[PDB]
Amino acid sequence: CRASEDGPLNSRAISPWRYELDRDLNRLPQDLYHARCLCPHCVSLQTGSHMDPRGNSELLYHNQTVFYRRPYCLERRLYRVSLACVCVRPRVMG
């Protein structure tokens, strides 16, 4: 849960995220890497090392085109890969 300087853009954002693996034996590509938000809350720009609770870590999603070798025969369905996290301001009721 820290922000570095070189990057690229994954260790440089206020709410960083790490790339996790999802493997399948009939998908193109074989290896997909979703976005997983690591820091529960956004970090302070004063240091960039430690987190502050004033913000929220909310994922974003888009639909990616994948091909499935379902019994051979090919298949085309929309797939769900999280692209990146954003720091959104909270909702307060009352």
Partner: protein, 238 residues
């Protein structure tokens, strides 16, 4: 004597590729309004005010809010309407917190390498923070109906004691105290009890917290870390 029959089709229309020697005009006016059906469920209302050669009309709506969504509906015409002696339609399910860009064009439309595009209207769906749509399936499970009734008492300069009513949904809760900067941050765990349903949390604070703002964020598994929040203020208790 025309009437409105409407359906669903998304993607390429058959007349989009084909050419047409003569082209209809265009929809002179177009309007959209939100109308709620009695029980909730919400459906979009599309009413436009409009020649002899004319076939149908297509409506496509796009939503862009933390997701991607795209739907289209074409409404056909039953028979020609020469008389001057204005239609409407109810055909789109509306989500929560979604901006909608809606545009319609007559079919057939302007041939390629020619001008005269259509016009569009815009509208933003009501959120979950209002009273009308606070009974939705998502909102209540996300915490719209829960009433924490926060009563936080400042014990002393360093410690603050917070009372809040619990719920069966969650067991761990955030805690924030913001006046100008962050002076209080803590994490707690509490088991839910039917006999006793009030919590007591002690949090250390740096600096004078008198008159601060108490912000309660629950850890409900169904809404992640971006869950709804409830207001609280430092109340001095004798």
């Amino acid at each position: 004597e025309p009437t409105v029959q409407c359906g669903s089709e998304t993607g390429p229309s058959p007349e989009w590729m084909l050419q047409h020697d003569l082209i209809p005009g265009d929809l002179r006016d177009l309007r959209v309004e939100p109308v709620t059906t009695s029980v909730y469920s919400i459906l979009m209302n599309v009413s436009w005010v409009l020649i002899r050669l004319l076939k149908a009309t297509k409506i496509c709506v796009t939503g862009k809010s933390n997701f991607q969504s795209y739907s289209c509906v074409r409404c056909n015409y039953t028979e020609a309407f020469q008389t001057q002696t204005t239609f409407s339609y109810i055909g789109f399910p509306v989500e929560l917190n979604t901006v909608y860009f809606i545009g319609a064009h007559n079919i057939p439309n302007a041939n390629m390498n020619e001008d005269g595009p259509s016009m569009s209207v815009n509208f933003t769906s009501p959120g979950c923070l209002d009273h009308i749509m606070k009974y939705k399936k998502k909102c209540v499970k996300a915490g719209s109906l829960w009433d924490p009734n926060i009563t936080a008492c400042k014990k002393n300069e360093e410690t603050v004691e917070v009372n809040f009513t619990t719920t069966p949904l969650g067991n761990r809760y955030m805690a924030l105290i913001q006046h100008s900067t962050i002076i209080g941050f803590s994490q707690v765990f509490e088991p839910h009890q039917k006999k006793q349903t009030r919590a007591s949390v002690v949090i250390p604070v740096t600096g004078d917290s008198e008159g601060a703002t108490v912000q309660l964020t629950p850890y409900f598994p169904t809404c992640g870390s971006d869950c709804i929040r409830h207001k609280g203020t430092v109340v001095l208790c004798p």
